[PDB]
Point group: C3
């Protein structure tokens, strides 16, 4: 398993950490949402949560990444939820498919469970 | 009307507050976006705004929730904008359909109106 | 070129800054994602990044805006990635199509490039 600390940022001003698909995968529109493996696992730094978002270059090529909320204490594998919009899309191993944004986790008094 | 304070968090490390649909509703792809009632109303805690996002279990079952921005001072009913992706989806009363994330509302000098 | 400082907020409690399309554009579902020009350019205020999100009134009328991450140091034109969901959609010049949300850019030790 690899932790979020092994992810890289493309440039210092980049909001997101790059997420790559560990497999070659073909997607068609009729398949609906598919969860792509990344080999990267939670959890997140204290007081943060994560959002998985698309890369614009990839969205413009017809692969939609559904925004995904990564809880602070999730310890499973971070997967990318994606769908081919209109056309057949092929994702090659190591292609950068999405990005992870880290955001502050605000405290509230809402009851738990 | 019920306020956001009555929402619950599944676990202490959960980023989102659960939102449930108050009605049983059937959605098909050709229907396009539908606004699901929740019986929960703004406004939000000072200096925050809200984002409505999907639950990954629900997105993987073919119901897409369009990310929705909840303004700090909105006092209407928070509705979930959703679409069946490819298949017929049935939402039962009380099913958890989406989640509300609270985020800091940054001040800027942009002119207002 | 116009900077983000020229954008306006609809009301003081509005989370987003309004983004308008500078052209008249017709979109159909089979076209897939389209990048709409706005004439607004990065970069963003220090320690922030941007998210492009839809307006709910517009999403409910069948135009989906794909959430887009605006990096802090991007100096190009901010474009709106959008898709007609099911029907033909016509966007007129000056119509408010999306909104820009500003969020804190959290520092991490992740390696760069
Ligand atoms: O795109 C996503 C969305 C969620 N999850 C994992 C992390 C979340 O903590 C967990 C539960 O999802 P939600 O209930 O937060 O949506 O699933 C992902 O791997 N990818
Ligand atoms: O998914 C959504 C998106 C918005 N709204 C309500 C709250 C917002 O303050 C208001 C106006 O929407 P926007 O203009 O912020 O998108 O509509 C919802 O109930 N659900
Ligand atoms: O909806 C979007 C998404 C991105 N970009 C520009 C700003 C980003 O800094 C840049 C690279 O996109 P990403 O790699 O962050 O997705 O493209 C846009 O104009 N509109």
């Amino acid at each position: 398993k690899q932790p979020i600390s092994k992810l890289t940022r493309a440039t210092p001003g980049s909001a997101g950490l790059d997420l790559c698909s560990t497999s070659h995968t073909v997607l068609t529109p009729e398949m609906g949402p598919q969860a792509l493996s990344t080999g990267i696992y939670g959890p997140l730094p204290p007081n943060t949560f994560g959002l998985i978002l698309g890369r614009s270059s990839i969205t413009m090529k017809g692969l939609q990444v559904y925004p995904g909320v990564i809880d602070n204490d999730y310890t499973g594998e971070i997967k990318i939820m994606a769908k081919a919009v209109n056309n057949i899309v092929t994702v090659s191993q190591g292609n950068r498919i999405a990005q992870l944004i880290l955001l502050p986790l605000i405290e509230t008094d809402n009851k738990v469970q």
